[PDB]
Amino acid sequence: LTATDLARHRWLTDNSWTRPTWTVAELEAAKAGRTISVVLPALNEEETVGGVVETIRPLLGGLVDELIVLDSGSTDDTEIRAMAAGARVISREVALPEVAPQPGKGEVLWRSLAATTGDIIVFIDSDLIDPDPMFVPKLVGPLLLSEGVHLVKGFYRRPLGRVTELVARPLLAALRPELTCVLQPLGGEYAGTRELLMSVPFAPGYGVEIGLLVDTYDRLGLDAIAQVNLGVRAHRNRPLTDLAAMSRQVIATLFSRCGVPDSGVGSLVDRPPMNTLRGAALEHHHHHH
Amino acid sequence: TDLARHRWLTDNSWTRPTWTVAELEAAKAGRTISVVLPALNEEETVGGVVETIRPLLGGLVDELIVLDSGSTDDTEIRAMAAGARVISREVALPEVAPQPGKGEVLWRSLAATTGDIIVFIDSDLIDPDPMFVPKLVGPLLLSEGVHLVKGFYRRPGRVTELVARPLLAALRPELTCVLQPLGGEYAGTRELLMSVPFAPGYGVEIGLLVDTYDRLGLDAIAQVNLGVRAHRNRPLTDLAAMSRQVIATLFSRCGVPDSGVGLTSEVSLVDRPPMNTLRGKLAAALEH
Ligand SMILES: O=c1ccn([C@@H]2O[C@H](COP(=O)(O)OP(=O)(O)O)[C@@H](O)[C@H]2O)c(=O)[nH]1
Ligand SMILES: O=c1ccn([C@@H]2O[C@H](COP(=O)(O)OP(=O)(O)O)[C@@H](O)[C@H]2O)c(=O)[nH]1
Ligand SMILES: [Cl-]
Ligand SMILES: [Cl-]
Ligand SMILES: [Mg+2]
Ligand SMILES: [Mg+2]
Ligand SMILES: [Mg+2]
Ligand SMILES: [Mg+2]
Ligand SMILES: [Mg+2]
Ligand SMILES: [Mg+2]
């Protein structure tokens, strides 16, 4: 047993839930004045965005205080379908007028920090085929009930992806081995506190998830990170060209957080902490005494 | 930088090698060629691979060796029947205790061979073609300044496209021109191979590629198409362990601190030293 194994074992005991079965009523009662914003990033998801919004809508006015689709420049019917399904639709330009947009998912999530007011922000992908209504309660459970948790990663069980298992987890094993305890570090369903999310830079495009995970870990360690089982979902097939581009950006973002230079050979920049434009900051763990 | 890749492809990459065996034999000019097949429990395929190379023995090829990596099946007996000399890891380098992995096997073969050119061919190949060795040694014999030839297959793998090529893009960007940097069929000069450390296990190919690039340059590397072959579907658990070691070896060659922590997998950051440090007199005898 290695030091990584030992930490993983205890981290799973304290910070991982295979059955995150908190009730909505219990979570509402735990808010204690805190508010919850749910953000769906969306670029051309007309076939699925309404279905995702529809699974979250029953929580509006209770557990969830706002439900926003942050549109990324869609040209299909994404925006109007999200409206009819009951979401608030905000463009990248309206979310943060003073900064010109650049492409990619990371830009959308970063801008959503300026468009939301919740003390807890939940991100859910708008391309999900089978969203489940309990996603949001499961993701916010540890933030509302567990001392010291600032980031919650939702993972799926598989029926009994390649970038995660060949790129992200092996690179974390090399560079930040304690983080190999996180089952799906690239997953798009996760939640965080405003205090954390406003204080960290946002990586562009496909790098935003891994960047947030390492930035959280480097400031607060394993104690601040939790994970919850959202249910059983089969892997979807993505073209190898897409996976290679995702891998290249995961590498670039991991390298930038871990002190490894990157050629830039494949143009998008990291965005600074939103508290430089709209933001009490997050207290890091002390490295001195 | 696309121009750099473009220039290299036109001079150092062959999609359709024209060379005949007779042409290559005439060009040897006193150089000798050793062919080494690493083998660990390959009883079903090692004979078929050896049989495709044996007709060259005594002509283009001066020795044909299967370096047995501790097999417990009929690998050794079937390799001898097909015409190869079988050499164990212990015999190849007796005073150094063996450690597991393919890199160990290829490194040790340097002490058991005499060729000015050494050709490595995997013993698990299902459809070996008799022109593999001729195509691999073509650029070494007929071009100037080439020291490492990488055999690639035209496709009709996930670790190459998701791990090796993107990491090279990040850390050795010129090397993304190499189509299949992890491929197990390749040839090198004695001068190169005797003088570089060998990475362990699954890292040996990428280690040799990067060390060759740094020490001798892009123009010392070539690649040749060995034919159309389909990707063999390996279990993702095997691919993950392979990826982890490719990462450790590239990090070792870049000075990135690698934890040495495996996947919950065997990973090593410890190279073997250049063989000319342990076999200095053999190495000097083979110079010039
Ligand atoms: O520039 C972008 C790219 C993606 N997305 C959204 O982010 C989620 C994850 O995107 P994905 O990684 O699937 O993008 P892909 O690889 O399909 O382009 C989906 O809900 C997309 O609609 C977005 O809002 N803006
Ligand atoms: O410790 C080892 C591992 C592999 N091999 C040989 O090296 C080649 C490439 O091995 P491969 O990567 O297929 O190994 P695997 O993934 O099957 O363990 C094959 O001819 C194996 O027999 C070897 O001699 N020793
Ligand atoms: Cl993935
Ligand atoms: Cl591969
Ligand atoms: Mg999409
Ligand atoms: Mg528009
Ligand atoms: Mg998706
Ligand atoms: Mg703490
Ligand atoms: Mg084998
Ligand atoms: Mg093989």
Is the shortest distance between the CB of B180 and ligand 2 below 6 Å?
no
- B4 contacts chain A (CB < 8 A): no
Say if the Cβ atoms of A266 and B236 lie within 8 Å: no
Say if the Cβ atoms of A177 and B247 lie within 8 Å: no
Q: Which chain B positions have a beta carbon within 8 Å of A174's beta carbon?
A: 244, 247-248, 251, 256, 258-259, 261
Q: Which ligand lies nearest the alpha carbon of A49?
A: 1
Q: Which ligand lies nearest the alpha carbon of A187?
A: 3
At the topology level, CATH places domain B1-286 in: Spore Coat Polysaccharide Biosynthesis Protein SpsA; Chain A (3.90.550)
Element (H, E) at B97: none
Residue A139 Cα, ligand 1 centroid: separation in angstroms? 20
How far is it, in rounded angstroms, from Cα A250 to Cα B245?
18
Tell me which architecture the domain covering A3-276 has in CATH.
Alpha-Beta Complex (3.90)
From the centroid of its chain, how far is CA B70? 19
- SS3 percent helix, strand, coil of chain A, rounded to 5, is 45, 15, 40
Q: Which chain B positions have a beta carbon within 8 Å of A170's beta carbon?
A: 163, 240, 243-244, 247, 263
How far is it, in rounded angstroms, from Cα A82 to Cα A88?
8
Residue B232 Cα, ligand 10 centroid: separation in angstroms? 8
Among the listed residues A187, A195, A179, the one whose alpha carbon sits nearest the alpha carbon of residue A228: A187
C-beta of residue B156 within 8 angstroms of C-beta of residue B86: no
Nearest residue (CA) to ligand 1, atom 3: A105
Burial readout B55-78 (b: 16 or more C-beta within 10 A, e: otherwise)? ebbeebbbbbbbbbbebeeebbeb
How far is it, in rounded angstroms, from Cα A15 to Cα B145?
58
In sequence order, what E strands does B27-115 have? 33-39, 63-68, 85-88
- A180 contacts chain B (CB < 8 A): yes
**Cβ contacts of residue B136 below 8 Å, gap of 6+?**
B119, B149, B151, B185, B186, B187, B224, B226
Nearest residue (CA) to ligand 2, atom 8: B122
Amino acid letter, residue A275: N
Phi, psi of A128, deg, nearest 5 = -70, 130
Among the listed residues A260, A257, A163, the one whose alpha carbon sits nearest the alpha carbon of residue A217: A257
Nearest residue (CA) to ligand 1, atom 16: A242
Whose tokens are 């070896």? That residue is B249
Query: Using a CB cutoff of 8 Å and minimum separation of 24, what contacts does A87-90 make?
Result: A87/A40, A87/A53, A87/A57, A90/A115
Going A112 to A118 to A122 to A126, the CA torsion angle's sign is negative
B26 by Cβ neighbours in 10 Å (0-12 / 13-18 / 19+) ranks as exposed
How far is it, in rounded angstroms, from Cα A181 to Cα A9?
8
Hey, what are B203's tokens? Answer: 């890292």
Is the shortest distance between the CB of A108 and ligand 1 below 6 Å?
yes
DSSP codes, B277-288? HHSHHHHHHT--
How far is it, in rounded angstroms, from Cα B73 to Cα B233?
23
